[PDB]
Design a protein around this ligand. Structure first.
Ligand code: HG
Length: 120
């Protein structure tokens, strides 16, 4: 199967501010697979920060608990990432994808959405 991903919602934001990223997915991937938001800081590799499962349950990395919130809408085929209490460590390109896309030979990452956090 082929999936297509389009992230949006990023931009320049002051420290402590907030942003909401959106992730529109093709086919039936949001409802069928577990979805996750990834970020790739300058120099680093993509890391999973938030994951949402078929039950609607969520799991986060320690650094983002209380600041990030992930949610999805199956009808809209969209995965959301509410980002609060932003820090310079949150400056990165943010991507969404299937929680298991390593199995798929079509390594399809999206263009992502850039997030930049300034200093008041
Ligand atoms: Hg916070």
């Amino acid at each position: 199967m082929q999936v297509q991903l389009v992230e949006s919602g990023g931009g320049l934001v002051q420290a402590g501010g907030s942003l909401r990223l959106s992730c529109v997915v093709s086919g039936s991937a949001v409802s069928d697979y577990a979805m996750g938001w990834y970020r790739q800081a300058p120099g680093k590799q993509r890391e999973l920060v938030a994951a949402i499962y078929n039950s609607g349950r969520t799991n986060y990395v320690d650094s983002v608990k209380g600041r990030f919130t992930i949610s999805k809408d199956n009808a809209k085929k969209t995965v959301y990432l509410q980002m609060n209490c932003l820090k310079p460590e949150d400056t990165a390109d943010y991507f969404c994808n299937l929680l298991g896309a390593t199995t798929m030979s079509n390594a399809v990452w999206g263009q992502g959405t850039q997030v930049t956090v300034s200093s008041h």
